Structure 1
């Protein structure tokens, strides 16, 4: 056939008497050519079931993988899942092939919970230099599957093994993205490994250093999680200084250094001795720069702490010194 509606003629004949070329025309010209004509011919031969018009006609004019897989979802084309898990169109993609290995692992879950789940996981794990978080996110999705299977011990096996194995290559090889982008990724990777702090325990006292070398560049988002973990596993002066410098030395405009000053003062009190020289001295050394981050957040520590010191004289010296720096 060389024209259209020849499809419908063949359909009428086969129907009164009741074809991948119709699919080749279901994936036809790009922008609004038919997207429905060969679809209607194959889907109204008489009518039996398209079962592929949806997938092919939605891959004609990413998420075309879902556009396919939702056609015959649970088990109707249960054998055609082989084709339906495919989104290849061989090209460069970001989140798409890692998402695709994750989706074939979910298909494996529905198919037997192991039949190609870790197969697809390892397949995507044997990819090019990391340099990007799509691969780390697919491997950590596989690790989330590990922690999901409720197997605590072997889930920690998978977490440790293939979440400290990215610690050999988390990011920074090549690309038009020049920022390494390993810090937050491998922070979430350590989160999935241990010290998730909301689900699992069994993190050692060295878990704080694990989180530190799990950032390995900086932890600006996770100064909070690092502070919590450090004052849980240690609850000491190293933890206090860790949280302080975690907010202070990571990023300016103190969305971190305000909470860092709070951590420094409150920890130097409730771990390192109360009302002492260390609290107020570290407080001054932390909030020296301390612009009006919110309104004025560099006196609300030292003035009140010099008043808690108990001495009217030092409290008054610090009160004049802070009121001469109240509202600049």
Structure 2
């Protein structure tokens, strides 16, 4: 049986999958007639390779004997076998050899870090997460960042160290994940730092989120700033949002700003905000906005401000009295 597997290996099979299956058949045979040390040394003979080999696995010009050392079936089998039938240091050496052979996967980064965390090496788990994080660039490093940042916050390492981690993710987060990362940076800053720092983190977040989530991020910033501070301090956030956002977002944020200023009691400031949004908003596509301004003027105002409102309304109608706006308005009217 030993020599028959030996010459089975010596056969140049037609596929690296076939040679992989024969090597794991030898290992399964020994494991059946349990010889765990022999099975480990058979897998070592299988996966024997030079230190810095880069043989193409899918190269159908070299021998399968040459290019099964980078087979991921053998290495998965070998690392699980060593994990079950040997110690942490031996399994750790197999994992480092996989990482050196560069067939490592984020699944393997997480498995290696989980093995070290189950053996209660939390700092070594963090080190393995860092190694995977500079091995995979960003859009896979976010999966690693999810797991690593939750585990690091749960482990409660030093606040400057956690701040460094969050800046390290924020360095080249795409906006899609920047929403999540900035939210959790602000959350950590609230629970363990200072709320002024959390507010400036949220301001950078409002600058650096995607265009889909920018109004949502501004609203999150406004709600948390209203909770942690005053509405007079949420005023400049409203001003920046209505200065930077697109048209519909700016209309909605101007309406929220005017409502907040009316609640505070500054009727003239609310009137100015409504005039600004009236400039930006076309009546045949914003009837609810014009109705809201009419409600504000009949709850707070006189007939002079009311005729000023109607003068502004028909001036905006004259401004938007173009062919382009006619196309847009007719399309919206017969789409609604």
| TM-score normalised per structure 1 | 0.59
Alignment deviations for residues 108-166 of structure 1 (CA, whole Å, 9 cap, x no partner):
211214251122244456679x7x455576456433212112x3xx4534322332456
Contact in 2 for aligned 1:275/1:309 (Cα 8 Å): no
| Aligned-partner SS, 1:112 | coil
**8 Å contact kept, 1:163–1:189:** yes
Equivalent runs, 1:98-137 vs 2, <5 Å: 100-114=108-122, 116-124=124-132, 132=138, 134-135=140-141
Name the residue aligned to 1:90. 102
CA distance in 2, matches of 1:160, 1:298: 43
Structure 1 residues 39 and 294: CA distance shift in structure 2, 3 A: farther
CA distance in 2, matches of 1:269, 1:309: 9
Question: Which residue of 268, 271, 283 corresponds with 2:261?
Answer: 268
Matches of residues 1-328 of structure 1 in structure 2 within 5 Å? 10=4, 28-29=16-17, 36=21, 39-40=24-25, 42-44=27-29, 47=32, 68=76, 72=80, 76-77=84-85, 79=87, 81-82=91-92, 83=94, 86=98, 90=102, 100-114=108-122, 116-124=124-132, 132=138, 134-135=140-141, 138=144, 141-149=147-155, 151=156, 154=157, 156-164=159-167, 170-171=171-172, 183=175, 185=177, 188-195=180-187, 200=191, 202-213=193-204, 217=208, 220=211, 221=213, 222-246=217-241, 249-250=244-245, 252=246, 254=248, 256-270=249-263, 273-274=264-265, 276-286=267-277, 288-290=279-281, 296-315=287-306, 318=309, 328=329
Q: Secondary structure at the match of 2:102?
A: coil
Deviations 1:232-288 (A, max 9, x none): 3332334233145336514x363x335423432233234xx3261111311332453
Question: In the aligned structure 2, how far is the partner of 1:205 from the partner of 1:90?
Answer: 44
- Gap regions ≥5 residues in structure 2: 47-56, 59-71, 318-325, 330-336
Task: Output the CA distance in 2 between the equivalents of 1:20 and 1:292.
Answer: 82
Backbone CA RMSD of aligned residues: 5.2
Cα gap change, 1:317/1:294 in structure 2, threshold over 3 Å: closer, same or farther?
Answer: closer
Change (3 A) 1:280 1:188: same
Pairs aligned (count)? 279
2:69 corresponds to which residue?
Answer: none
Q: Distance in 2 between matches of 1:122 and 1:311?
A: 65
Tell me how far apart the structure 2 counterparts of residues 234 and 20 of structure 1 sit (CA, whole Å). Answer: 75
C-alpha separation between the residues in 2 aligned to 1:113 and 1:290?
Answer: 60
Bigger mean CA offset, 186-195 vs 114-123: 186-195
Residues 20 and 113 of structure 1, relative CA distance in 2, 3 Å threshold:
farther
TM-score by length of 2: 0.58
Contact 2:278 2:313 in 1 (8 A): no
